[PDB]
């Protein structure tokens, strides 16, 4: 027909919203029922809500749907806003008096409905009057579309007003496979596509794509092939797109609800060496937790707190575990992203991020510098109370409909939090200690290729009686290692710096 | 930039209106962070020289009239922040060599793209002068300093926006260096309350840990005199190393400074040291106090008897 994917969410719509219009009026009057006059659809944007309405309109041979934009109506002047509403139904009013019950169906679409409630009342009253009051008109069907259903007032959901409500979800593997066929039918049917392009393999690569992104991918793949000949030149007889074109195209479209790999890779991780058994144990436990998440139904929410001395290396283990997981959705809420925003802006941003996190089979959230987000200072102490309750509630809430996410946050003020009485939110705690032995320093120096063994042993010999009880984290040690490499006397500088740091 | 020069000067070349002694290759290297409009302005100014006269020197003189963005704030750094430099002790040389090593490390490493150092000590030691002197010898294209003088008479909201905009501009050149002066005064600290602004502190705390994008790098220097206050607000985990600047406590350094400042003949320079030997052998004063007391003594009728009195008072 023209729509792929959604199969079970279309039969139900056709059963209720349109099944009655087919039958002759005689039997309908015999039954003693009335036609439904409202319908609501909600879901994430760019998923194909208008397409199904347009395509189901053609089967009934109805008039071409009109369209209205909520923000457009609200933005115009008040008088024109009041006047234009009566204009939409003019044709339905005329044809009704013209013919009577034997008239044809007219369908109207309304977009961004929730904008009217987000603050307007005149348009809502006029809409309800035409479909419920003594001015009832028996030839129209109104469809409303919104991205946030909880904001629509409950008064509109009672019988006689928007009786039927439906939800649209992101496509499954089968949905992506079917939409690809729907898009490439024309190329396939006229022999302009190579024989090496395999769609079953393409379906898996695009993970959290929506339909629009798949269409854009096809467009870019066609553009790749087209550009290869220009610079217009008559050679167009053997033009055939190939797999390599689509593989190159994949690196061109970055989707929403996708992996923010750049932040994970660049800023956070720039070196990783296993100098002790505890690091291996921590990584093994992290991998075990990941596999627990992947193959269990009883655990859908896990939150962890990694704590240790300042500069221990907390942020590196989290990102290292996250990257190897291979999840489709990964994101971080950090002071960098929240910098420069107002308090209410921060509340809205956190709420929106959490709402977005509830729209993927698997997710990861990294909250950076938990104590800094609340803007705590020990002098007062001072803090913003409103943000604290939001964060406290959000850390326990579960995602809906068999979805799962993992939240991880880092802090160095364990005493402040335990005093604040929010330690009941975190399911488990992990402690990452600092180095306390010289044999660990030997491995650290070895794996970074600081210099030859002859000078390597001398540093240990000197530190053996310089200061045997040093206590320094990985960051400072690795910074001193590099800052001693650009000097005339590496040994003395390294020894002095490491002793001073301790 | 060479191709931009070629495009701009093609019209001049094509009509034999350009001298043969001008080489575009050297100009492509002298202009380090210029843009197309900057090159257009430079060419226009150079041609103005030739027009007014009725060459290479024309462009060299035009280079002195156009100042680009992302350039060097030469006047602010050179004049106010540096008014003398003398090696009175070994510690100064050690600090300078460490600073040079760090500057070279930042330029010749991939792992280190963000280095922060903290310079603290008793008031009047000379921290700010060292901070600017280290940056001046680096030669990086981009240099800026944030001091209270810029933010005087501003509101808090404008202050945050200004600092954030400066840090945003910092991420658009291959190399950058930033200087922060008198951290405690920027935050409006008074101990009775204590009173201060928390939003600016949090913004600075977040900024100091961020890393630049796309294999870019920058260096940060900060000067302070309230180490204990910074300890109270637990922001000591941001800086990866510290340097201490003590005051003077020996008469040999005083003699060296006196010799360097051209006080007077050795006869009186010996007498001053002999008097201070048993006047107060345990004095402790900074460089700023001494370099002003020496200035004061010179214009007096009895410099020897006045400098000793000033040293006694300061101690
Ligand atoms: N095994 C390791 N574990 C942790 N950090 C490591 C390791 N190997 C190398 N590093 C280096 O340690 C440096 C310190 O990491 P990072 O800055 O994330 O630590 P931190 O203690 O969370 O810091 P912050 O003081 O900002 O809270 C990183 O640049 C990383 O390059
Ligand atoms: N080796 C030196 N190091 C520092 N300053 C020196 C040195 N030799 C001479 N001076 C002079 O010391 C004077 C005082 O230094 P400077 O102006 O940097 O003060 P400061 O430490 O920034 O002051 P304040 O603590 O009041 O902010 C400078 O004018 C400089 O001319
Ligand atoms: N299942 C699907 N099959 C083919 N195309 C789809 C599908 N879902 C969405 N699209 C594409 O989405 C576009 C229209 O989506 P849109 O009108 O923006 O819906 P909504 O506004 O409800 O997100 C069309 O160009 C269509 O090709
Ligand atoms: Mg971190
Ligand atoms: Mg100062």
Q: B13: phi > 0 → left, psi -120 to 50 → alpha, else beta; which?
A: alpha
DSSP one-letter string for A422-488:
-TTS-SEEEE---B--HHHHHHHHHHTT-S-HHHHHHHHHHHHHH-TT--B-HHHHHHHHHHTTTSS
The annotation status of B173 as a binding-site residue, yes or no, is no
Ligand 2: which of B84, B135, B225, B290 to mutate, judged by most atoms within 8 Å of the beta carbon?
A: B84
Whether cis (ω within 30° of 0) applies to the bond prior to B194 is yes
Ligand 5 center from residue B106 Cα (angstroms): 25
Those residues of chain B whose CB sits closer than 8 Å to some CB in chain A are: 101-102, 104-105, 108-109, 111-112, 160-161, 164, 194, 198-199, 201-203, 205-207, 210-211, 213, 232-234, 236-237, 240-241
Number of the ligand closest to the Cα of B132: 2
As a residue count, chain A comes to 502
Query: B162-167 long-range CB contacts below 8 Å, 24 or more apart?
Result: B163/B200, B163/B203, B163/B204, B163/B207, B164/A339, B164/A340, B164/B203, B164/B207, B167/B207
* Cβ-contact B88, B126 below 8 angstroms: no
Distance in Å, alpha carbon of A476 to nearest chain B alpha carbon: 7
Backbone angles phi, psi at B52, to 5 degrees: -70, -30
Closest Cα in chain A to B159: A340
- Lining residues, ligand 1, CB within 6 Å: A 270-273, 279, 310-316, 474-475, 478; B 209, 237
Torsion angle defined by CA atoms of residues A151, A152, A157 and A158, in that order, rounded to the nearest 10 degrees: 90
Which of B278, B186, B168, B256 minimizes the C-alpha distance to B226? B186
User: CA-CA distances (angstroms) from residue A63 to A14, A60, A91?
Assistant: 17, 9, 11
Close Cβ partners of A490 (under 8 Å, ≥ 6 residues apart): A450, A451, A455, A484
The whole-angstrom separation of Cα A167 and Cα B99 is 63
**Hey, what are A443's tokens?**
């491995």
Q: Collect all residues of chain B within an 8 Å Cβ-Cβ radius of residue A485.
A: 105
CA distance B38 to B41: 5
In sequence order, the β-bridge partners of residue B218 are: B114, B176
Measured between alpha carbons, how far is A337 from A233 in angstroms, rounded to an integer?
Answer: 49
A121 neighbors A114 (Cβ within 8 angstroms): no
Residue with tokens 């008559």, as numbered in its chain: A234
User: Distance of CA A30 to CAs A15, A25, A33, A102, B206, Å?
Assistant: 20, 8, 8, 16, 73
Contact between A456 and A446 under an 8 Å Cβ cutoff? The reply is yes
Tokens of B104: 């070279």
CA distance A332 to A357: 11
Q: Kindly state if the Cβ of B288 falls inside 6 Å of ligand 2.
A: yes
Nearest-angstrom CA–CA distance, B302 and B298 = 8
Overall resolution, Å: 3.4
Instruction: Say how many C-beta atoms besides its own lie within 10 A of residue B75's C-beta.
Output: 8
Can you list the alpha helix ranges (DSSP code H) found in A76-172?
78-88, 90-99, 114-117, 121-132
Dihedral pair phi/psi, residue A362, rounded to 5°: -135, 145
Asked if B202 lies within 8 A of A375 by C-beta distance, the reply is yes
Q: Quick one: how far is CA B249 from the chain centroid?
A: 27
CB neighbour list of residue B246: distance below 8 Å, 6 or more residues apart? B91, B121, B122, B125
Residues of B in contact with A434 (CB under 8 A): none
Distances, alpha carbon A237 to alpha carbons A97, A191, A192, A234, A240, in Å: 58, 11, 9, 9, 9
CA distances from A336 to A356, B112, B198 (A): 19, 20, 17
> Does the annotation place B122 within a ligand binding site?
yes
Residue B297 to residue B294: CA distance in whole angstroms: 5
Q: Give the list of residues 6+ apart from residue A434 with CB closer than 8 angstroms, or none.
A: A308, A309, A312, A471, A472, A473, A474
Q: Taking Cα atoms as reference points, which of A40, A76, A43 lies closest to residue A153?
A: A40
CA nearest ligand 1 atom 4, residue: A313
Contact list in B for residue A267 (CB cut-off 8 A) is: 210-211
B135 in a labelled binding site: no
**What's the rounded Cα separation, in Å, for the pair B60 and B21?**
13
Asked whether the CA dihedral B248, B250, B253, B257 is positive or negative, the reply is positive
Across the interface, which of A270, A372, A378 has its CB nearest the CB of B205? A372
Structure tokens that stand for B109 in this block = 């490493």
Distance (Å, rounded) from C-alpha A56 to C-alpha A28?
21
CA-CA distance, A213 to A202, in Å (whole number)? 13
Integer Cα distance of A42 and A381 in angstroms:
45
Compute, in angstroms, the gap from residue A182 CA to the centroid of ligand 3.
Answer: 12
Do the beta carbons of residue A385 and residue A344 sit within 8 Å? no
Contact in structure between A445 and A459 (CB atoms under 8 Å): yes
| Smallest CA–CA distance from A493 into chain B, residue | B98
Report residue B210 as tokens: 């961020």
| B302 phi and psi angles, rounded to 5 deg | -130, 75
Q: Give the count of alpha carbons within 13 A of A174, CB side only.
A: 4
Helix (H, G, I), strand (E, B) or coil at A305: strand
CA B19 – CA B214 distance, rounded (Å) = 41
Whether the CB-CB separation of A417 and A424 falls below 8 Å is answered with: no
Q: Which tokens hold the place of B177?
A: 């260096």
The strands making up A404-411's β-sheet, listed across from edge to edge, are A329-333, A362-367, A404-411, A301-307, A428-431
Contact B170/B187 with Cβ under 8 angstroms? no
CB contact under 8 A, A475 and B240: yes
**For ligand 2, is residue B86 a contact (CB within 6 Å)?**
yes
In Å, what is the CA distance from A134 to each residue of A131, A138, A157, B255? 9, 12, 19, 106
Tokens of A157: 């959901």
Q: Residue A166: beta bridge partners? A: A41
Burial A13-42 (b: 16+ CB within 10 A, else e): beeebbeeeeeeeeebeeeeeeebbbbbbb
DSSP A155: G
* Residue A328 tokens, joined: 């489709």
Please state how this structure was obtained.
Answer: cryo-EM
Token pair of B107 as six digits: 């330029």
User: Residue A149 has which token pair?
Assistant: 């259903």
Cβ atoms of residues A117 and A158 within 8 Å = no
Helix segments in A271-378, DSSP class H: 277-294, 314-325, 335-338, 343-356, 370-373
Residue among B160, B198, B234 whose CB faces A382 most closely: B198
CA distance B83 to A189: 82
Question: What span, in angstroms and rounded, lies between the C-alpha atoms of A498 and A484?
Answer: 10
User: From CA B24, how far away is CA B14, in angstroms rounded?
Assistant: 15
How distant is the alpha carbon of residue B132 from its chain centre? Answer: 2
Q: Which residues of B touch A339 (CB under 8 A)?
A: 164, 203, 206-207
Closest CA to A65 of A125, A17, A9, A107: A107
3-state DSSP assignment of residue B219: strand
Distances (CA, A) of A175 to A214, A304, A390, B120, B191: 11, 35, 37, 63, 66
The answer to whether A407 touches A306, Cβ cutoff 8 Å, is no
Contacts of A417 (CB under 8 A, 6+ apart): A370, A371, A411, A423
| A295 token code pair | 């193959």
Q: What CA dihedral angle connects A346, A350, A352 and A353, to 10 degrees?
A: 130
**Of A182, A212, A213, residue with least CA distance to A199:** A182
8-state DSSP, A62: P
Distance, in Å, from the CA atom of A462 to the CA atom of A412, rounded to the nearest integer, reads 33
Q: How far apart are CA A410 and CA A370, in angstroms?
A: 6
Find out whether the peptide bond into A63 is cis, omega within 30 degrees of 0: no
Kindly give the pairing relationship between strand A140-146 and strand A164-167.
Answer: unpaired
Instruction: Please provide the distance, in angstroms rounded to a whole number, between the alpha carbons at the two ends of chain A.
Output: 73
Q: What is the CB < 6 Å shell around ligand 3?
A: A 3-5, 45-51, 179, 182, 211-212, 215
CA of A310: how far to CAs of A117, A270, A411, A482, B97, in Å? 48, 18, 9, 20, 29
Give residue B205's Cα distance to chain centre. Answer: 22
A38 within 8 A of A159, measured Cβ to Cβ: no
Q: How far is CA B41 from CA A48, B50, B60, in A?
A: 53, 15, 13
Q: Which residues pair with A331 in a beta bridge?
A: A365
């Amino acid at each position: 027909l023209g729509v792929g994917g959604l199969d079970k969410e279309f039969t139900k719509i056709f059963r209720r919203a349109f099944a009655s219009r087919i039958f002759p009026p005689s039997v309908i009057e015999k039954l003693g029922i009335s036609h439904v006059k409202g319908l609501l659809l909600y879901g994430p944007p760019g998923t194909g809500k208008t397409l199904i309405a347009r395509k189901i309109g053609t089967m009934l041979n109805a008039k071409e749907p009109k369209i209205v934009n909520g923000p457009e109506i609200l933005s115009k002047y008040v008088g024109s806003s009041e006047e234009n509403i009566r204009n939409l139904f003019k044709d339905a009013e005329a044809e009704y008096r013209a013919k009577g019950e034997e008239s044809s169906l007219h369908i109207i679409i309304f977009d961004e409905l929730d904008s009217v409630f987000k603050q307007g009342d005149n348009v809502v009253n006029q809409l309800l009057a035409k479909m419920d009051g003594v001015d009832q008109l028996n030839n129209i069907l109104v469809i409303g579309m919104t991205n946030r259903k909880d904001l629509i007032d409950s008064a509109l959901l009672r019988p006689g007003r928007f009786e039927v409500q439906v939800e649209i979800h992101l496509p499954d593997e089968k949905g992506r496979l079917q939409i690809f066929d729907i898009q490439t039918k024309k190329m396939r049917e006229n022999n302009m596509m190579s024989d090496d392009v395999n769609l079953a393999e393409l379906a898996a690569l695009t993970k959290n794509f929506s339909g629009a992104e798949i269409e854009g991918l096809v467009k870019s793949a066609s553009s790749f092939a087209i550009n290869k000949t220009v610079n217009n030149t008559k050679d167009i007889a053997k033009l055939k797109v190939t797999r390599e074109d689509f593989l190159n195209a994949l690196n061109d479209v970055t989707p929403a609800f996708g992996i923010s790999e750049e932040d994970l890779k660049t800023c956070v991780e720039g070196g990783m060496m296993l100098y002790s058994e505890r690091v291996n144990s921590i990584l093994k436990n992290g991998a075990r937790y990941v596999r627990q998440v992947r193959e269990s139904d009883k655990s859908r929410l896990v939150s962890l707190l990694i704590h240790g001395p300042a500069g221990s290396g907390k942020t590196a283990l989290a990102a290292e575990i996250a990257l190897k997981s291979g999840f489709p959705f990964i994101r971080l809420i950090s002071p960098n992203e929240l910098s420069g925003m107002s308090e209410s802006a921060k509340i809205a941003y956190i709420d929106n991020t959490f709402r977005d996190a509830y729209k993927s089979p698997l997710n990861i959230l990294v909250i950076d510098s938990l104590e800094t987000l609340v803007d705590w200072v020990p002098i007062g102490p001072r803090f913003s109370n409103n943000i604290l309750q939001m964060l406290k509630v959000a850390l326990k809430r579960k995602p809906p409909q068999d979805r799962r996410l993992l939240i991880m946050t880092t802090t160095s003020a364990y005493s402040v939090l335990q005093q604040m009485d929010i330690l009941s939110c975190f399911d488990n705690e992990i402690a990452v200690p600092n180095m306390t032995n010289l044999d660990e320093l030997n491995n650290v120096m070895i794996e970074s290729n600081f210099l030859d063994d002859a000078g390597r042993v001398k540093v240990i010999n000197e530190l053996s009686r310089s200061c045997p009880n040093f206590n320094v984290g990985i960051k400072k040690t690795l910074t001193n290692i590099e800052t001693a490499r650009h000097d005339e006397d590496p040994v003395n500088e390294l020894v002095e710096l490491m002793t001073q740091s301790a």
